[PDB]
């Protein structure tokens, strides 16, 4: 079986590696997330750009910026497309944190993503076929 913390960390680890940064099953789910983000990058690029816009990051504003974006994303409900977008957003925040010399924020972002998944997303995933439902389509 999977671990939500493992999934978040593999995804962030991958997105940092893409941009040339070294940091530090759940694997199949992480690979599924990469496939789904790639897919959405070819079709929902404006929506991804609009979420990542207004990312002005400082260590004392990082959490509030994360919370505002993710709370707007899920305020009127959860679907699989919003879960994909949540991963894309957290990844972008992690690479922007490294680009702007705020590399201590990467593990905080991984923690906020892990807590948010577990407290606000996990029951929806479980009620709607588990990670398997998602892996079945994009795996």
């Amino acid at each position: 079986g999977y671990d939500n913390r493992e999934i978040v960390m593999k995804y962030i680890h991958y997105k940092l590696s893409q941009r040339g940064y070294e940091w530090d099953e759940s694997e199949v789910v992480h690979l599924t997330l990469r496939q789904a983000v790639d897919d959405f990058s070819r079709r929902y690029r404006r929506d991804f750009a609009e979420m990542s816009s207004q990312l002005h990051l400082t260590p004392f504003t990082a959490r509030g910026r994360f919370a505002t974006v993710v709370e707007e994303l899920f305020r009127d409900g959860v679907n699989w497309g919003r879960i994909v977008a949540f991963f894309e957003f957290g990844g972008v925040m992690c690479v922007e944190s490294v680009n702007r010399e705020m590399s201590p924020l990467v593990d905080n972002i991984a923690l906020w993503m892990t807590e948010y998944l577990n407290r606000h997303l996990h029951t929806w995933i479980q009620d709607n076929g588990g990670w398997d439902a998602f892996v079945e389509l994009y795996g």
């Binding site: 959405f40 079709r43 929902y44 929506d47 009127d76 959860v78 699989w80 497309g81 919003r82 977008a85």
Partner: peptide, 11 residues
């Protein structure tokens, strides 16, 4: 949910 993003129309 109320569609506010293009991916909402697929779900």
């Amino acid at each position: 949910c109320p569609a506010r993003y293009g991916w909402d129309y697929e779900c």
